[PDB]
């Protein structure tokens, strides 16, 4: 009923408290332990349920802070959502000295992203920019063990980023954990996630 019963690391517990997160929401209670367990998760719950906190907490708890390598990749369907994610992670991560979380979106020179990726624990970005950075080997995906799709319905809908995500998924290490979080779970999304998750655990309220 508090974040302690979820067995999170002390830095994450202290960060949550500092950032105003006093008690977990119903979806946070359910999803966080299962995330810590290393399972592939599909978290489907309506807006207002606390889903960004869910994957942000799982992500920060999983990080090897002393290893300055990109261990976590998070994709978002819009520039604004990518930054929203960065804000939550950097708030919850406030007691983790030297945490490096960076946003990769269009409009910044690729040379600048290359430099930033030299010191980056958690990469958050849009699928097109992330694919370009992996193709250039500016983001070497060799240490990524956690791959998160935020607003997965928006990412994988018709006219969106399925082709780019398929490519990125394939570039990553075979051994990794996947999280997909979404307000809805239509057939197109159920279908698309079969490419990435062999037997996912579902989390709903
Ligand atoms: N358990 C909680 N306790 C207090 N505040 C929370 C909690 N969960 C989320 N919040 C607040 O909401 C912000 C955004 O996180 P969150 O609610 O997880 O994402 P969101 O983008 O609103 N997605 P969702 O809530 O699922 O629609 C945080 O920065 C907090 O200010």
Residue numbers in the entry: 62 to 266
Sentences from the paper on this structure:
DExD/H-box RNA helicases, from virus and bacteria to eukaryotes, play important roles in processes including ribosome biogenesis, RNA processing and folding, ribonucleoprotein (RNP) remodeling, RNA nuclear export, the regulation of RNA translation and transcription, and nonsense-mediated RNA decay. DExD/H-box proteins often contain accessory regulatory domains and localization modules, but their cores consist of two RecA-like domains joined by a short flexible linker. The N-terminal domain is commonly referred to as conserved domain-1, or DEAD-domain, and the C-terminal domain as conserved domain-2, or helicase domain. Both domains contribute to the binding site for RNA substrates and both contribute to ATP hydrolysis. We used X-ray crystallography to determine the structures of the DEAD-domains of DDX2A, DDX2B, DDX5, DDX10, DDX18, DDX20, DDX47, DDX52, and DDX53, as well as the helicase domains of DDX25 and DDX41.
DDX20 (Gemin3) is a component of the SMN (Survival of Motor Neurons) complex that is involved in assembly and reconstruction of different RNP (ribonucleoprotein) complexes. DDX20, Gemin4 and eIF2C2 form a separate complex that contains numerous miRNAs. DDX20 also binds to the Epstein-Barr Virus Nuclear Proteins EBNA2 and EBNA3C. The poliovirus-encoded proteinase 2Apro cleaves DDX20 resulting in DDX20 inactivation and reduced snRNP assembly. The P-loop is in a wide-open conformation when ATP is bound, as seen in DDX20 as well as in the previously published structures of DDX19 and eIF4AIII. The AMPPNP-bound DDX20 structure contains no metal ion. Lack of γ-phosphate coordination by a metal ion leads to a shift in the position of the β- and γ-phosphates, which bind where the α- and β-phosphates are bound in other ATP complexes. Since the adenine base is coordinated in the usual fashion the α-phosphate and the sugar moiety are tilted out of the expected positions. This illustrates that DDX20 (and presumably other helicases) can bind ATP also in the absence of divalent cation. However, a divalent cation is needed to allow coordination of three phosphates in the correct geometry for catalysis.
